[PDB]
Structures are given as structure tokens and as C-alpha cells.
Amino acid sequence: YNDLRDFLTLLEQQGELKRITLPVDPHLEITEIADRTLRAGGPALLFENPKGYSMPVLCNLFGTPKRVAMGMGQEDVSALREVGKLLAFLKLNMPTKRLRGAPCQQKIVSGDDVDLNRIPIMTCWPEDAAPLITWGLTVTRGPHKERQNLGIYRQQLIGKNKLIMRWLSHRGGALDYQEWCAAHPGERFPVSVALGADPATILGAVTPVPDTLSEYAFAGLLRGTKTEVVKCISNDLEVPASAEIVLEGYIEQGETAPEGPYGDHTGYYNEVDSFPVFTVTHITQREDAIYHSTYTGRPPDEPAVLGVALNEVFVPILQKQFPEIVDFYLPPEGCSYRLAVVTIKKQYAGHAKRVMMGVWSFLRQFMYTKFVIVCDDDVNARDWNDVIWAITTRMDPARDTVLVENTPIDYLDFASPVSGLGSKMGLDATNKWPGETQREWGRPIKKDPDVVAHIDAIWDELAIF
Amino acid sequence: YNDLRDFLTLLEQQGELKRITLPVDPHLEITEIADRTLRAGGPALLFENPKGYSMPVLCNLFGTPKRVAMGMGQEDVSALREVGKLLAFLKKQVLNMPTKRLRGAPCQQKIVSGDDVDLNRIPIMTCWPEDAAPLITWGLTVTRGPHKERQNLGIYRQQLIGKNKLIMRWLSHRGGALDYQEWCAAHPGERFPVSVALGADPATILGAVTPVPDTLSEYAFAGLLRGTKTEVVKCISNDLEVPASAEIVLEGYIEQGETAPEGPYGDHTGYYNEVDSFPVFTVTHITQREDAIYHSTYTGRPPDEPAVLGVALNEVFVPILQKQFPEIVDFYLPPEGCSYRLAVVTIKKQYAGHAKRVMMGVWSFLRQFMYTKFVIVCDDDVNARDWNDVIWAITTRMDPARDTVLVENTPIDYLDFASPVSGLGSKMGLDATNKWPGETQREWGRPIKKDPDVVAHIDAIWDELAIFN
Ligand SMILES: Cc1cc2c3c(c1C)C(C)(C)CC=[N+]3c1c([nH]c(=O)[nH]c1=O)N2C[C@H](O)[C@H](O)[C@H](O)COP(=O)(O)O
Ligand SMILES: Cc1cc2c3c(c1C)C(C)(C)CC=[N+]3c1c([nH]c(=O)[nH]c1=O)N2C[C@H](O)[C@H](O)[C@H](O)COP(=O)(O)O
Ligand SMILES: [Mn+2]
Numbered sequence: 001y002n003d004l005r006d007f008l009t010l011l012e013q014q015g016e017l018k019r020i021t022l023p024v025d026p027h028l029e030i031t032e033i034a035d036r037t038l039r040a041g042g043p044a045l046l047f048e049n050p051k052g053y054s055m056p057v058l059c060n061l062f063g064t065p066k067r068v069a070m071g072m073g074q075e076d077v078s079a080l081r082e083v084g085k086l087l088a089f090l091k092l093n094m095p096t097k098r099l100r101g102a103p104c105q106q107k108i109v110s111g112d113d114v115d116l117n118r119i120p121i122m123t124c125w126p127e128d129a130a131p132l133i134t135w136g137l138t139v140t141r142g143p144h145k146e147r148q149n150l151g152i153y154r155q156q157l158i159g160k161n162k163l164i165m166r167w168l169s170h171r172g173g174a175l176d177y178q179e180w181c182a183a184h185p186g187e188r189f190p191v192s193v194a195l196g197a198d199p200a201t202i203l204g205a206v207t208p209v210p211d212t213l214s215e216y217a218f219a220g221l222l223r224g225t226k227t228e229v230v231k232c233i234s235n236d237l238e239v240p241a242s243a244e245i246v247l248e249g250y251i252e253q254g255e256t257a258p259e260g261p262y263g264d265h266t267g268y269y270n271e272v273d274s275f276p277v278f279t280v281t282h283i284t285q286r287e288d289a290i291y292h293s294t295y296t297g298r299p300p301d302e303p304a305v306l307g308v309a310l311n312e313v314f315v316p317i318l319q320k321q322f323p324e325i326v327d328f329y330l331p332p333e334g335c336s337y338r339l340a341v342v343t344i345k346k347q348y349a350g351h352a353k354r355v356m357m358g359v360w361s362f363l364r365q366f367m368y369t370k371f372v373i374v375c376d377d378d379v380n381a382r383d384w385n386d387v388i389w390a391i392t393t394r395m396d397p398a399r400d401t402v403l404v405e406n407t408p409i410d411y412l413d414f415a416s417p418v419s420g421l422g423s424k425m426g427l428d429a430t431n432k433w434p435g436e437t438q439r440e441w442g443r444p445i446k447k448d449p450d451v452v453a454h455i456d457a458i459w460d461e462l463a464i465f
Numbered sequence: 466y467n468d469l470r471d472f473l474t475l476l477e478q479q480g481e482l483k484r485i486t487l488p489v490d491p492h493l494e495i496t497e498i499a500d501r502t503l504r505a506g507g508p509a510l511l512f513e514n515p516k517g518y519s520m521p522v523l524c525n526l527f528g529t530p531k532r533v534a535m536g537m538g539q540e541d542v543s544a545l546r547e548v549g550k551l552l553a554f555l556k557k558q559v560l561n562m563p564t565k566r567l568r569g570a571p572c573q574q575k576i577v578s579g580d581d582v583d584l585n586r587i588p589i590m591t592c593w594p595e596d597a598a599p600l601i602t603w604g605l606t607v608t609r610g611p612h613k614e615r616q617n618l619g620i621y622r623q624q625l626i627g628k629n630k631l632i633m634r635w636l637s638h639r640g641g642a643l644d645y646q647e648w649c650a651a652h653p654g655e656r657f658p659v660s661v662a663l664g665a666d667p668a669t670i671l672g673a674v675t676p677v678p679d680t681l682s683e684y685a686f687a688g689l690l691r692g693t694k695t696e697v698v699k700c701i702s703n704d705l706e707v708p709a710s711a712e713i714v715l716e717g718y719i720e721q722g723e724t725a726p727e728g729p730y731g732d733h734t735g736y737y738n739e740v741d742s743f744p745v746f747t748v749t750h751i752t753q754r755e756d757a758i759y760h761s762t763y764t765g766r767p768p769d770e771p772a773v774l775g776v777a778l779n780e781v782f783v784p785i786l787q788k789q790f791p792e793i794v795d796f797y798l799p800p801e802g803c804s805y806r807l808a809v810v811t812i813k814k815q816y817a818g819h820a821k822r823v824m825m826g827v828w829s830f831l832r833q834f835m836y837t838k839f840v841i842v843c844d845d846d847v848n849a850r851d852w853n854d855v856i857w858a859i860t861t862r863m864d865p866a867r868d869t870v871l872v873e874n875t876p877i878d879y880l881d882f883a884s885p886v887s888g889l890g891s892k893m894g895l896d897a898t899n900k901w902p903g904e905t906q907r908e909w910g911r912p913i914k915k916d917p918d919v920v921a922h923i924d925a926i927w928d929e930l931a932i933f934n
């Protein structure tokens with residue numbers, strides 16, 4: 001049973017983990033180092049000597065797509081499509097195996113002894129309001145079913161034992177809380193947060209499984225074995241037995257705090273807003289605990305890289321519905337969800353428009369995607385040289401652009417005319433068939449596949465780089 | 466005086482030239498290798514062992530903008546901006562800079578003529594699988610008209626159609642085609658002398674492709690880029706002058722009335738153009754160096770070497786645009802947009818609506834951009850040349866329907882089959898600037914700026930951190 005430490009050893013053996021012994025400040029400096037590292041596609045980083053703390057800080061864990069694949073037990077990034085077919089089928093799944101004891105409860109501190117200032121919580125960007133917890137798996141139950149939701153919600157430090165719980169309203173945690181308030185007026189909402197669980201559990205948290213299903217069950221499928229958990233000390237929620245640190249407590253109904261500003265995955269600061277306060281009554285941890293953290297900012301960042309790997313999971317699901325789709329890609333540069341490029345085997349005049357409408361309606365992850373570019377299958381969706389070529393040689397802008405107004409848009413997207421509402425643009429860059437054009441369309445240059453294959457074979461021997 | 470061989474030694478010293486000793490076919494395989502190389506921003510390539518020939522093939526010479534700059538003697542590509550300002554002023558007496566004529570030159574060490582001429586001995590490349598035939602792609606075609614002394618140099622592609630016959634595919638507004646057309650009127654039925662140089666020095670090659678006036682010889686502009694007069698030699702069979710340092714020269718004539726169906730050939734748009742008739746160039750002499758090297762390239766789906774050349778030569782217009790529109794910080798036409806079809810412009814925005822004035826300027830000020838169908842406008846925090854910045858701007862600063870300008874029934878290239886009607890089509894401008902009060906009623910986002918003190922500290926300890934190892 002691989003916990004997180006086993007994963008770090010695996011990475012270190014493969015030159016995918018680097019230990020920093022120099023003094024480095026959790027205030028701003030770690031983010032700067034990790035940002036350079038990620039942008040050059042370097043290793044995961046373990047800062048063994050954070051200025052002013054004894055607990056090492058692990059970050060950039062999932063800063064390459066390879067390391068996301070490795071964290072699901074697979075060799076490479078193409079294996080992620082198979083986990084996508086699996087995800088199709090859930091739309092008996094395996095419960096958790098509850099241990100009687102666990103390393104994450106070796107050292108326990110509670111009540112007045114709780115001090116989150118002892119943890120090397122990072123400050124990411126210069127005008128961020130305060131230190132911010134960024135890799136917490138938040139565990140909740142609602143009042144109406146047994147299912148335990150795991151989510152990643154950022155958490156601002158506001159006291160020795162107070163965090164802000166910044167879940168957006170469509171998240172599992174926020175729905176569970178909202179229902180608890182209606183169904184049990186005035187009663188404290190139990191909550192627990194696990195830091196540094198095994199990678200299958202972490203990636204399971206972030207994969208959008210149904211709300212009906214526990215993210216613990218999915219992680220079991222990725223792992224091949226049941227997720228090992230332990231009952232929390234102060235509530236009936238279960239947390240991963242291998243966790244490095246666990247926070248337990250509750251949300252007092254009505255209690256809220258102004259959150260942020262914080263730099264966001266779009267590369268801008270979110271302005272201040274109110275969210276629930278999470279009161280921390282217990283902090284449990286391993287001997288030798290490692291603090292797992294990250295940051296978001298201008299893309300690409302670790303979330304963006306996670307998001308590119310998880311898009312591979314969705315390709316199969318889309319292809320099941322739309323078998324004409326050859327590839328489907330959401331570039332990191334587009335803030336991970338705002339632009340999609342789709343390639344198809346076009347079969348009839350107008351086909352591109354059906355595909356756009358499918359991207360905008362089929363799955364909710366893409367409901368808010370404001371640019372969609374559709375191309376033929378001779379275009380590599382992942383290369384702007386091909387995509388721009390297609391746009392500039394197969395479109396007449398006014399004929400081939402679809403605009404739709406008053407559509408749902410992310411409420412934090414300041415570029416839309418009104419919060420929550422905006423337009424979308426679809427670019428039909430497919431070759432135009434009779435009916436779509438009265439001109440003689442051009443015959444595109446295709447490569448000889450035998451020449452390509454021969455050059456693949458002798459490429460290393462050629463030794464050009 | 467740097468000839469081409471000196472340039473290749475310079476490149477090799479800097480890891481910018483790679484010699485391939487493996488057997489490689491000029492039919493299709495070289496193009497494939499060069500294409501991968503260029504798309505990964507790799508070196509120039511010298512295939513020392515082309516399957517079925519003894520003459521090495523040089524390609525991807527100018528596949529990088531750096532190497533275009535190096536070929537003009539410079540560190541970087543901006544020196545072309547100074548040429549921008551110079552070309553402005555002519556609309557400078559010692560820009561009446563002639564050629565220096567040598568008697569004898571390495572390009573005439575080995576000579577072959579009449580029935581001995583066999584172009585099949587040259588490793589002429591076939592670029593794409595459905596191309597009609599092997600194609601000469603880096604020939605500097607030299608011509609004189611009957612009415613002035615000026616020698617025009619152009620690059621016109623030439624299909625192989627016989628042991629001693631090429632098709633001369635010059636479009637009708639080119640210098641060569643005008644010279645020929647005038648010769649026919651002024652000397653009915655007389656053969657039109659023409660010569661083609663392969664593998665000249667880099668300043669000559671780059672000069673050939675610069676858009677100088679028809680009044681001026683492209684040999685004179687190369688002299689300005691070089692700093693010294695272009696060294697030439699008289700041809701054997703005519704009075705035209707070719708670069709002394711050329712690796713190979715073809716001499717001959719066009720027989721009036723003689724034409725051949727040309728192509729299909731794949732071209733810089735990434736499509737095949739269909740068959741069409743052009744004059745036939747009859748080759749009477751082939752002169753060359755000892756150890757001659759064949760310089761070639763290919764055009765196809767961008768980016769290719771022509772596109773990269775085109776991008777470096779557009780730097781010439783930035784200064785001219787900036788004189789008119791000083792708000793413009795950068796102006797870039799990516800190769801992947803067929804070199805002219807999309808432009809990205811960055812500005813210091815000064816008032817609501819500013820992006821729209823700029824779009825209209827791109828579409829109206831200069832003729833080279835009249836036919837540009839997409840324009841993206843951004844602020845000066847965006848590097849116009851990095852799709853990671855440009856896509857970021859588009860996706861964080863636009864509402865698609867509010868911020869997109871479409872205009873219909875505008876001039877479009879007649880060969881752009883994607884427009885509804887030949888010569889007529891729409892254009893799109895994307896305003897991706899930050900929206901000011903008036904343009905939006907929302908509170909706009911404040912971007913994340915780094916602490917310069919943090920950055921500086923990390924620069925200092927970066928090597929000691931040793932993240933790579
Ligand atoms: C990986 C990751 C995902 C974050 C995230 C972060 C990371 C590292 C941070 C901490 C660096 C900064 C932004 N975080 C938030 C977030 N979702 C959310 O509602 N609020 C957030 O603050 N997301 C997304 C959220 O965790 C995923 O969408 C879950 O799949 C939601 O699960 P649920 O649907 O079960 O609630
Ligand atoms: C660099 C380069 C430029 C080509 C070119 C090529 C290259 C490598 C080829 C050979 C690979 C394939 C497409 N070529 C043609 C071409 N112009 C033309 O009329 N027919 C062509 O076939 N162009 C452009 C043309 O040579 C330039 O516009 C010259 O500046 C013309 O000079 P002029 O204005 O003095 O006639
Ligand atoms: Mn969930």
C-alpha cells in the first residue's frame with residue numbers, strides 16, 4: 001500500500017524529486033522557485049529547511065503530466081484515457097477500509113494548544129491577504145446521505161485556530177453545509193481536512209466524479225485496493241490513514257470572514273468576498289510530518305497541469321457521445337477551461353456547429369468555455385502552428401464564426417458585461433463542403449506515412465539535437 | 466569577404482550547423498527531416514550523403530530568425546528596423562552602390578555545356594508526395610529588361626521537365642516576368658537571356674528577397690547589409706552578372722512562345738495549387754565549384770523557411786507603422802498564419818475604443834496588410850510573439866460578442882479560396898485590451914505582479930539551489 005512517502009521515494013529514484021537544503025522562506029520565495037521549476041518542466045521539490053519552521057514543505061508534486069500519470073500507478077499520460085472509460089461506466093463500488101490506528105494520529109494537539117502558526121503555510125503572491133492552505137482535502141458529509149465528498153478548497157489563515165473555507169457554491173462541501181443548515185438549524189457543521197494523503201486519494205479528490213459517489217471509492221479503483229482510512233477523533237468523518245497532517249473542527253453557523261484578495265489561476269487577484277469560518281479544534285500528524293502545498297497564478301501552474309492530464313480522462317467520454325471527435329484539448333494558456341480546440345472527422349455540411357453545441361452543453365466542466373475552435377483531423381489540436389494555419393486558411397471570419405449571447409459565465413470572469421452572464425464564440429475552421437461555399441476548395445498537403453515512419457526509425461541515429 | 470562556406474563554418478562553430486552522414490533521399494525524406502528540425506527550432510542541415518548523388522544538400526539555412534540576423538552580420542533581428550527607416554526616406558547618393566566585377570571566380574571552376582548538360586546529376590528535391598516533379602527552390606534568377614541596366618534578382622520556383630529544361634514560374638508582377646514581357650515586345654522572336662545562381666553568400670540571398678523598388682538592383686541592397694560591394698562575375702554565355710561565390714550557376718534562355726504546364730505543387734499556404742502554364746527556361750551551361758554544395762529548401766504548411774524569412778523581413782515595417790501610430794509597441798505576423806493573414810499588435814492604450822482605431826490602421830495604412838483578415842490587439846504587457854501571452858489576453862480580457870469586430874465585403878486575396886467570392890471577404894478584429902470605464906461597468910482585474918526583491922534573491926541563489934544537476 002503506497003502512501004505518499006513511498007511515492008516520494010519512487011520519484012527520487014527517477015530524478016523527479018529534488019531536496020533543497022538552503023534556507024527558503026514560505027513567504028513568497030518558495031512560489032518563485034517552484035514557478036521557475038515548473039515552467040522549465042523540472043522535478044517535484046522538497047524544501048527541507050523552510051526559514052522559521054521544522055516541517056519540510058513539498059510542492060510542485062504534480063508539475064509535469066508524467067508525474068500525474070505516475071501518481072495513478074500508470075507509466076505514462078496516454079493511460080489516462082483508460083481511466084476515462086472507467087469513469088464513463090459509473091454513470092458495487094468499493095467502500096473504505098477503516099483501520100483501528102494510523103500514522104496521521106501519532107502526534108495530537110487540541111483546544112487551546114492548536115496553533116496553525118507552527119505549520120509552514122505559504123504566502124504565494126505579494127498582495128495576497130495572508131498565508132493560504134492550498135492542498136487540503138476537505139472531507140464532509142451532508143445530512144441526507146452517507147457519501148463522504150472530498151474537495152480542494154483554499155483556506156486563508158485568520159487566527160491560531162481559524163481558517164476561511166473558500167468553497168464555491170456548486171462544490172460538494174458547500175452543498176453539504178447548506179443542507180445541514182436547513183436540516184439542523186444552529187448546529188455546528190463537522191469538517192476535517194487531510195494534508196498529504198497518498199496520490200491516488202489526492203487525484204481522486206480532484207477528478208470530477210458524480211456527487212452521488214465518494215471520491216474515496218474512485219481512488220480505490222485507480223489504486224486497485226481499498227482506500228485505507230481512520231475515524232477522526234472529534235467526529236464521524238474518515239480521513240486517509242497515511243495523511244501527513246489532519247485538521248479537525250467545525251463551521252459555526254452564520255460565522256463568516258472577508259476572504260482575500262488572493263491571486264488566482266487566471267493570473268489576476270480575486271477581490272475580497274465573505275466565506276464560512278472553519279474553527280480548528282484538533283491537529284493530528286505523523287512523526288516527521290511533511291507539509292504539502294502549492295500555488296495558483298498565471299498559467300501554467302500545478303493546477304493547470306493537473307487540468308491537462310484530467311482532460312485526457314474526458315476525451316473518451318466525449319468520444320462515446322460524439323464519435324466524430326478525434327481530439328479535444330483545453331490549452332493551459334486559456335486559464336485551463338476558457339478555450340477548447342476540437343478536431344473531427346467531418347461527415348456533412350454544418351457538422352462543426354453540432355460539435356460546438358455539444359462542447360457547450362454535454363458536460364458541465366465545459367459549460368463555461370467561451371471560445372471553441374473546430375478543425376478537421378489533419379490538424380494537431382495541440383500545436384498552435386496547425387490551429388492558426390486552419391483558422392487562417394479555412395475560415396471567412398464573418399461566415400464561419402458563431403456568437404451566442406446571454407450564456408452562463410463564471411461569476412469571477414470580470415471580462416463579461418455582467419457577473420454570471422456573457423457571450424461565447426465558436427470558430428468553424430473545418431474545410432467547407434458544397435453548400436457551405438461555392439468555390440473550389442484547396443487540396444491540402446498530406447505527408448507520405450512511409451516517409452514519416454522511416455524518419456522516426458533513423459531519428460535518434462541522425463542525432464540532430 | 467564572407468562567401469557561403471565561411472558562413473557555414475561560423476554556424477558550425479556555434480552549434481547551428483549539423484552534418485548528416487546517413488544516406489538520405491532528396492525525394493521526400495530531406496523535407497521531412499528539415500520540417501521536424503525547423504518546427505523544433507533546430508540548426509541548419511548539411512546532408513553529406515544524399516542517396517544517388519555526390520553533391521551535398523544544404524537546407525534549413527534560415528530556419529531560425531537568429532540565423533537570418535547572423536546572415537546579415539548582426540547579433541539580433543532588429544538591425545532590420547534601421548533598414549525600415551532607410552527605405553522610408555526614398556519616397557542617400559552612395560546607396561547607388563554598384564557591383565564589383567571579378568575576372569574569374571570559383572563558381573566557374575567546372576563548366577559543362579550543350580549536350581553535356583544534365584540537371585539530373587543535381588540533387589534537386591521533391592518536397593511533397595503529390596508534387597509534379599523535382600523543384601529548384603533557392604535559385605536567384607537574374608534578368609535584365611531591354612530598357613534599363615538594372616539587374617533584378619528574384620526567387621522563382623523552377624520545375625524540372627528535362628535534362629536541360631526548367632519551368633520559370635514567375636508571377637506577372639515580378640521583375641523577371643516584366644523584363645521578359647518587355648523583351649518580347651521590343652525584340653520579337655529573340656531568345657531572352659537568363660541566369661540562375663545557387664548558393665550565393667547570405668547577404669546576396671537575403672537581399673534578393675527584400676522588397677526593394679523595381680528601379681534598384683537587389684545587388685545594391687545586399688551591399689548595404691554587408692557593408693562592402695557585392696562581388697560578381699560575368700556569365701559565360703551572356704552579359705548578366707552572378708555572385709562570384711555561387712556554388713552552382715545555370716545559364717541559358719527562354720525561347721519566346723515556349724511554355725509548359727507547371728505543377729501541381731504544394732505551396733506556402735499548405736495546399737497544392739492546380740496546374741498552370743509558364744515559360745520554359747532552356748539551360749545551355751552549368752558552371753560550378755570544385756566540391757559544389759546544392760542549396761535548397763521547401764515551402765509547405767507554415768511555418769517553413771520562407772515564412773521565417775518573411776517574419777524577419779517584416780521587422781522592416783514596424784518603424785514605419787510606429788511613425789504613424791506611436792502607441793504601437795510591437796507588430797507581428799506569425800509564420801503559421803501564412804505570413805500575412807493574421808497580425809498581433811501590442812499598444813500603450815490611451816483612451817476607450819483605442820483598439821478599434823489601431824485595427825483600422827492595420828487594415829488601411831500600408832498595402833502589405835490590406836489583405837490581413839485577423840487582427841488581435843493587446844496591451845504592452847503581452848509579448849506578441851508568444852501564444853501563451855496572446856491566448857492569456859484573449860481569454861481574460863475579452864467578451865467575445867462585445868469585443869469582436871467583423872467587417873464584410875473587404876478586399877481579399879483572389880487565391881484565398883476560403884472567402885465566399887473571389888477577391889472579396891470579411892475580416893475580424895479581436896480587441897483584447899483591458900477594458901476601461903465606458904467599455905465595461907465591472908471592476909477590472911489587477912494582474913499579479915512579482916516582488917522584484919524576491920526575484921533578485923532567487924536569481925542569486927539559483928545555481929546553488931541546483932535543481933537541474
Ligand atoms: C487542485 C486544486 C483545486 C482547487 C483549488 C486549488 C487546487 C490546488 C487551490 C487551493 C490551489 C486554489 C483553488 N482551489 C479551489 C478549488 N475549488 C474551489 O471551489 N475553491 C478553491 O479555492 N479547486 C477545485 C476543486 O478542488 C475541484 O474542482 C474539485 O474536483 C471539487 O470537488 P467537488 O466537486 O466534490 O466539490
Ligand atoms: C524565399 C522564397 C521566395 C519565394 C519563393 C520561394 C522562396 C524560397 C520558393 C522557391 C521556395 C517557393 C515560392 N517562391 C516563389 C516566390 N515568388 C514567385 O513569384 N514564385 C515563387 O515560386 N517567392 C517570393 C519572391 O521571390 C520574393 O517576393 C522576391 O522578393 C521577388 O522579387 P521581385 O519583387 O524583385 O520580383
Ligand atoms: Mn465530489
Ligand SMILES: [Mn+2]
Nearest residue numbers: 617618640683
Ligand atoms: Mn528586384
Ligand code: NA
Nearest residue numbers: 150151205206
Ligand atoms: Na471533489
Ligand code: NA
Nearest residue numbers: 618673674675
Ligand atoms: Na526582390
